[PDB]
Design a protein around this ligand. Sequence first.
Ligand SMILES: COC(=O)CC(=O)NCCCNCc1ccc(-c2ccccc2)c(Cl)c1
Ligand SMILES: Cc1ccc(O)c(C(=O)O)c1
Length: 328
Amino acid sequence: SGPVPSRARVYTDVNTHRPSEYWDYESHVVEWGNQDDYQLVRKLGRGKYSEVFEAINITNNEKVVVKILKPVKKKKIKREIKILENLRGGPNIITLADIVKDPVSRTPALVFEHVNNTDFKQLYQTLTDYDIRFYMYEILKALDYCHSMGIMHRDVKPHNVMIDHEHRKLRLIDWGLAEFYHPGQEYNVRVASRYFKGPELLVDYQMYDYSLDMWSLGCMLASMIFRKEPFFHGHDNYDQLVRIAKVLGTEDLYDYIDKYNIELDPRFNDILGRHSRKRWERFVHSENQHLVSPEALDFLDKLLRYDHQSRLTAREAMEHPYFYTVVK
Ligand SMILES: COC(=O)CC(=O)NCCCNCc1ccc(-c2ccccc2)c(Cl)c1
Ligand SMILES: Cc1ccc(O)c(C(=O)O)c1
C-alpha cells in the first residue's frame, strides 16, 4: 500500500505545538530596510539564482555580506527569510542583519553579518585531528539548534560552512533550501548537492527529517579525515547511490528499502550490482593516518547509515567520545 511512514526520533512535534505565526512563512510580512545604507565592494560568488557581494554599511562603516536573489520563486524567498528570522542568534547560525530591495531592477537582497572566509586549500593541509573535532563540534551546535527549532537545513556541504580560522569562528550559511519539519510531511527529494545527498533522497523516500543533515555531515567528516574530496563521488543521482553502496554494501541497502517498503526505481536495475560492506579502516592511508582514530571511525560509522532513523541525532553526536577532547 506504498511506503511505510517515518518520523524524526527527536524534536518531532516542535512545530505542531507552536502557533502558525512561527512556521507559516507564506503569511509572514516582510519589511524592507534602506538599500542606500549599503555600498557593494566586491563579488564573492554566484549561486543558481543568487549573487553574493561583500558590502559596507555606510551608516556604521561595518562590513556586511549582501546576497542578491533572482526572484524566480517568491514563496522560496519568504521561506528563507522566515527561517533566518526564527534562527537569528542561534549558535554558529549566520545572522540576517537586514532585507533590502532594488526598486529599479525589482530585486530582493538579504544582508548578513560579515564572515572572513579562510581559503580551505591552505587550511586542509594544516588542520590537525583536534581542529577537525573542534569545527565538527561547532557545526553540531548549529544543527542541534536548528533541529530544536523545527528546521532541517537540507544543504549541509563544505561551501555552506564558513570558517574564519584566525578567530576559530564558524557559521552555517545558505538557508535557501531549509524547511520546517512537520511529522508525516512528504518533502521534495530534489534538495542537497549530489555528493551530500542522503540515501533517502536517492531512493525517492519523501518522509525524511533532520537525520538528512546528519548524513551530509557524515560525508563532510569522511572527506576531512580521509582526505578524499568528495567521499562519495557520484556522476549523477542514480550513480550517487551506487557510490554509497560500494562502501556500505548492498545487503544493508535492501534491508533499508524493505523496512520502509520503498520501490527501487528501474534505473537502478543494471547499475547497482552486488557489493560487500567495507571496513572503514580500508580508507586509512599514509596521507590521512594522522587524522584517523578508533573514536573517529566509530563516530563516522554511526552517521553514515542507510537507515535515517538509526543515525545519531545532533545531540547524541555531541555526546560521542570523539568530542571528549573539545570544550562543550
Ligand atoms: C560565494 O559564497 C560565499 O562567499 C560562501 C563561501 O565563501 N563559502 C566557502 C566556504 C568553504 N568552507 C570550507 C570548509 C573548511 C573546513 C571545513 C571543516 C573542516 C574540519 C571539520 C569541520 C569542517 C568545512 Cl565543513 C568547510
Ligand atoms: C555570509 C554568507 C555568505 C554567502 C552566502 O551565500 C550566505 C547565505 O546564503 O546565507 C551567507
